[PDB]
Amino acid sequence: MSLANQIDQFLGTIMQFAENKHEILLGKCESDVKLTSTQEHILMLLAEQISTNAKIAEKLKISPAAVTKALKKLQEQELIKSSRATNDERVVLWSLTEKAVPVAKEHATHHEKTLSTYQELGNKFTDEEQEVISKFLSALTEEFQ
Amino acid sequence: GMSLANQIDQFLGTIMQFAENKHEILLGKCESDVKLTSTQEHILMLLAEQISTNAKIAEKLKISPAAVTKALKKLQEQELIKSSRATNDERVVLWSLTEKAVPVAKEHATHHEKTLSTYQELGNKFTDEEQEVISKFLSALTEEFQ
DNA sequence: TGTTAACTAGTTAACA
DNA sequence: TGTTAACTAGTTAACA
Ligand SMILES: [Zn+2]
Ligand SMILES: [Zn+2]
Ligand SMILES: [Zn+2]
Ligand SMILES: [Zn+2]
Known part of the structure; x- marks a missing residue:
């Protein structure tokens, strides 16, 4: 598969993953208040x-x-x-x-656990490989303005 | 959470923000005469x-x-x-x-081709090595959404 | 600035 | 299988 087709499919993969939310989180919402x-x-x-x-x-x-x-x-x-x-x-x-305080705190911790998963994904790569990837992301985001 | 994780997180953000109402991601304008x-x-x-x-x-x-x-x-x-x-x-x-839709259908296929083309150009800015590192990053990310 | 009207492009589930 | 009815969480227009 071309690098070009891979980027294509990756974008569509996160699209269906997001469904009708407006943000990407990893794992389930652990708030009883729905x-x-x-x-x-x-x-x-x-x-x-x-x-x-x-x-x-x-x-x-x-x-x-x-x-x-x-x-x-x-x-x-x-x-x-x-x-x-x-x-x-x-x-x-x-x-x-006051009732909302923990709901917010739970959402903050959710974002925070999504970021940890990424950081550890980023850690499978050498300081340089990571640099390459960082360049990639800057290049890609640019297409999107 | 360090620079790389934050850049990833923000990048996914930019995608969602670009996504909007569409359920597909295409670059450039839809050049079809019909809305x-x-x-x-x-x-x-x-x-x-x-x-x-x-x-x-x-x-x-x-x-x-x-x-x-x-x-x-x-x-x-x-x-x-x-x-x-x-x-x-x-x-x-x-x-x-x-018969009215034949051209619109054709334009949409073309739009997809152009979007692929833009992607390829972007990746062409990288050595074949550098494309392998990028390709492993993409596969690793895709994993998290299974 | 902020809010409703009217719409939008999708979802689930009951059922010819 | 494909339609519909009820719902959902966005959007832009225009003007409150
Ligand atoms: Zn939550
Ligand atoms: Zn959030
Ligand atoms: Zn088109
Ligand atoms: Zn398409």
């Missing part, structure tokens, strides 16, 4: 910094419309709460309820 | 190789027969394909292209 990957990710963000619809939408690279509806569902489930920015009283801020 | 999803065009492409059924098409696309039903219907309401059930009482329900 939420979309996107929702859990949002909770992860609010653990770091209180924020707005816009700020959330950009980190996730999805539409403010999609955020409006994810935030709303988390708000029905009392996982988040709104308040107003101090500088501009009209600005709507979102932050976590 | 169709890549899934719908890819169907047209398959039908050009071989008359077939909802199931065989669903198998090949790795999507559900219900998804196939809905896609076939849009293709059909745009008079790009036709079904045997309007003219034949055979048990098999076969889908075929209308």
